[PDB]
């Protein structure tokens, strides 16, 4: 596919410091577009991308009520899970939920998602059929029986195949100038001598969007996977991302190394080498 929408919910308990905080953020691919934080002075869904601002008041009030309602329900869920694990009321815990729909390059639903975790460990996930569940342990099994008894999967499937895809296509259109524009990485190779016989070659990729990218060093047509230092793609703060890969090589042998860059924004993969 080529596009997706995801909402990320995080509910954190904090005994002795008030009720569980609830935060929600929505994304279309790698662009955030809305947020809600129950700790804000005046909790309300707020815009985070230019193209979502045009939505009318009903949009924002509808969103805010959902997140306010969720704020309460997740506090109940945190109490439920604490009990499911026989945990103390003195510890802080976290429930996380990710859900959304994937669209193919044509715009058709590729697949839907809905997974939760408790304290960073997978808890329960809606299967790809959008009809059954996979519970991680006997605690999640209680959440499962409860959600099957309430026909939750049926509601998620309707939203995932319905509203989810509908609004994503609307967002893709309203923000097409950016959401449907891939920015290729600006690439170059640096050289950092480490010792008399070794030097570091660092292949850079800057200003690209979306975040997906492939950066690899090859020695003699061959890949240096186990010998390549690859930093995690990082956000520049202007919607674009950065990434670099490094390899230490024998001085004099730098011309035997080539950097290969693959990115949606590139009509053809790139091959770079250090240019003294």
């Amino acid at each position: 596919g080529s596009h997706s929408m995801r909402y990320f919910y995080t509910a954190m308990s904090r005994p002795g410091r008030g009720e569980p905080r609830f935060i929600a953020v929505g994304y279309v691919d790698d662009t955030q577009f809305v947020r809600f934080d129950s700790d804000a002075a005046s909790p309300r869904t707020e815009p985070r991308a230019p193209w979502i601002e045009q939505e009318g008041p009903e949009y924002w009030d509808r969103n805010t009520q959902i997140f306010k309602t969720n704020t309460q329900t997740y506090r109940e869920s945190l109490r439920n899970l604490r009990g499911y694990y026989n945990q103390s009321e003195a510890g802080s815990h976290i429930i996380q939920r990710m859900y959304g729909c994937d669209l193919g390059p044509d715009g058709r639903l590729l697949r839907g998602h809905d997974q939760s975790a408790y304290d960073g460990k997978d808890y329960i996930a809606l299967n790809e059929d959008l009809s059954s569940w996979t519970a991680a342990d006997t605690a999640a099994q209680i959440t499962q029986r409860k959600w099957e008894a309430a026909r939750v999967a049926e509601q998620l499937r309707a939203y995932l195949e319905g509203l989810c895809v509908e609004w994503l296509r609307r967002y893709l259109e309203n923000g097409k100038e950016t959401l449907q524009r891939a920015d290729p990485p600006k690439t170059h190779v640096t050289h950092h001598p480490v010792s008399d016989h070794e030097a570091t070659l660092r292949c850079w990729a800057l200003g690209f969007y979306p975040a997906e990218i492939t950066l690899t060093w090859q020695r003699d047509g061959e890949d240096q996977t186990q010998d390549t230092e690859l930093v995690e793609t990082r956000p520049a703060g202007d919607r674009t991302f950065q990434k670099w890969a490094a390899v230490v090589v024998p001085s004099g042998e730098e011309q035997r190394y080539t950097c290969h860059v693959q990115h949606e924004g590139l009509p053809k993969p790139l091959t770079l080498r250090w240019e003294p």
Binding site: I66, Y123, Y159, W167
Partner: peptide
């Protein structure tokens, strides 16, 4: 737009 219908507690 987020999943609208009231969510069921875990």
């Amino acid at each position: 737009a987020p999943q609208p219908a009231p969510e069921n507690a875990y």
